[PDB]
Each structure stands twice: as C-alpha cells, then as structure tokens.
Design a protein around this ligand. Structure first.
Ligand SMILES: *[C@@H]1O[C@H](CO)[C@@H](O)[C@H](O[C@@H]2OC[C@@H](O)[C@H](O)[C@H]2O)[C@H]1O
Ligand SMILES: *[C@@H]1O[C@H](CO)[C@@H](O)[C@H](O)[C@H]1O
Ligand SMILES: *[C@@H]1O[C@@H](C)[C@@H](O)[C@@H](O)[C@@H]1O
Ligand SMILES: *[C@@H]1O[C@@H](C)[C@@H](O)[C@@H](O)[C@@H]1O
Ligand SMILES: *[C@@H]1O[C@@H](C)[C@@H](O)[C@@H](O)[C@@H]1O
Ligand SMILES: *[C@@H]1O[C@@H](C)[C@@H](O)[C@@H](O)[C@@H]1O
Ligand SMILES: [Ca+2]
Ligand SMILES: [Ca+2]
Ligand SMILES: [Ca+2]
Ligand SMILES: [Ca+2]
Length: 195
C-alpha cells in the first residue's frame, strides 16, 4: 500500500496504515512526511543580541562581541579589574581578547608597573644631581638654582637685599648693590653726610 511511493523525507520511516501511512521522523523533524526541520531557535535562547542558528535537534548561538559563551551569557572584559597600574589607562583590543595600557609619565611596562629612570638621561641642569624615584625623579639643585630641573637662576634681588633704596643686580647665588647718594657698603647700609 501507500508506503510504496516513498513519501517520507529527511530519513523518516514509513509505516503502512489502513487507507494511508505514518512517517516516523528522525529526531529534529516533524510533519506528515517529516518535511519540517523543527526550529529549536523558537525559544530565543541566545542573550545579548546574539543570533540563534538552527540545527538538526539543536541550535547554537553566534554572539555579538564582547559577549561569548554558549548562550552569549559571558562577556569579554580585559579591562575589568583594570590591570594597568599607577594611573595607566586600560584600552581593550578590537576583538576584546587583550588589553594595552597607556602609562603615565614616569612609568612603563605592559601594566605600567616598571619605573622609568629619568636620571639615565638626566634632565637636571646647572650642575644639579639627579635622584631617581619610583614613578618620578628629583633634581637636587646647586646653590643659586631652583625649579623642577634646577633650571631657574634664583632671583636674589627679591626681596631686595640692598638697603636704603639701593638698586639690585642678580647673579649666580649673589646680588650686587648700586647705592643711592648718601649710602655705601656692600648692601648700602652705611650712610654718609645724612641729617
Ligand atoms: C528553547 O530555549 C531553551 C532555553 O531557554 C533551550 O533549552 C531549548 O533548547 C533545547 O535544549 C537542549 C537542546 O539539545 C535541544 O535541541 C533544545 O530544544 C530551546 O529550544
Ligand atoms: C505516495 O507518496 C505521496 C507523497 O509523495 C503520498 O501522497 C501518497 O499517499 C503515497 O502513497
Ligand atoms: C525508520 O525510522 C526513522 C526514524 C529512521 O531511524 C530510519 O532510518 C528508519 O528506517
Ligand atoms: C546574528 O549574528 C550576531 C553575531 C549579530 O551580528 C546579530 O546581529 C546577527 O543577527
Ligand atoms: C650631587 O648632589 C647634589 C645634592 C649637589 O651637591 C650636587 O653638587 C652634587 O654633584
Ligand atoms: C638703581 O640704581 C640706583 C643707584 C638708582 O639710581 C635706582 O633708581 C636704580 O634703579
Ligand atoms: Ca495500507
Ligand atoms: Ca532544527
Ligand atoms: Ca623614575
Ligand atoms: Ca641669582
């Protein structure tokens, strides 16, 4: 009878009946002739805007980065415990599988944990001594100089060391006084013919 026409598709098995037939489907198929591939994606199993891809008796999810895992329930977050130290900025890679760190001044290494020794190419000026520190440095100035890199010749004329209105000229750790009429001495402290 009716199974002679080989009606079942998708590998189903036909059984003859009174005035018809039944197809027993392989797992994953349904319909009178097993023509339907059951849509296991109908339950919307993929999270986080992943795409469900139907299979025979199953599905998978293609996740949208940075989500991953069987149902897009995991997230790639290489910057989550901020591996960049000492103020460094964490940047996630394009594919979210790795990170990089932009280090602050003074720091280097993959995670910004290695000091830079500024004294190797010392920025200190005017004979100052360079002291390297962890994440910085310090210049120790010679007499007469100030500033971060001991680059400033100190203004020895402020406050004015010249008494009695004398004019001050700055030098290296020194000041020179030109006295007003009536005054003399290194700092104009001596009066002559006054009152
Ligand atoms: C509908 O969504 C369910 C999760 O909320 C998911 O489990 C169903 O998938 C079944 O799980 C096992 C797998 O082998 C079967 O094919 C599938 O039907 C999903 O269809
Ligand atoms: C022969 O097969 C067809 C389907 O292709 C079915 O309609 C008939 O009943 C069967 O005998
Ligand atoms: C008949 O039943 C179906 C479900 C498949 O297992 C076939 O291979 C078999 O012949
Ligand atoms: C299915 O694939 C995932 C990765 C996302 O791109 C969705 O937009 C798409 O439908
Ligand atoms: C390095 O050390 C500092 C403190 C100054 O004394 C410099 O003259 C010296 O070379
Ligand atoms: C400095 O020189 C003294 C002697 C005065 O003439 C001042 O006014 C000047 O600034
Ligand atoms: Ca029959
Ligand atoms: Ca299916
Ligand atoms: Ca340093
Ligand atoms: Ca000076």
């Amino acid at each position: 009878n009716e199974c002679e026409s080989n009606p079942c598709v998708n590998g189903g098995t036909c059984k003859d009946m009174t005035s018809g037939y039944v197809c027993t489907c392989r797992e994953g198929f349904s319909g009178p002739n097993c023509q339907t591939n059951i849509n296991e994606c109908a339950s919307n199993p993929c999270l986080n805007q992943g795409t469900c891809i139907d299979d025979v008796a199953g599905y998978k999810c293609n996740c949208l980065l940075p989500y991953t895992g069987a149902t897009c329930e995991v997230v790639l977050a290489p910057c989550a415990p901020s591996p960049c130290r000492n103020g460094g900025e964490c940047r996630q890679s394009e594919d979210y599988e790795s990170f990089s760190c932009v280090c602050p001044t003074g720091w280097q290494g993959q995670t910004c944990e290695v000091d830079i020794n500024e004294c190797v190419l010392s920025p200190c000026r005017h004979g100052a001594s360079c002291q390297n520190t962890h994440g910085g440095y310090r210049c120790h100035c010679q007499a007469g100089y100030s500033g971060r890199n001991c680059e400033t010749d100190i203004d020895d004329c402020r406050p004015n060391p010249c008494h009695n209105g004398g004019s001050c000229t700055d030098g290296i750790n020194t000041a020179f006084c030109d006295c007003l009429p009536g005054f003399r001495g290194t700092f104009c402290e001596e009066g002559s013919g006054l009152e």
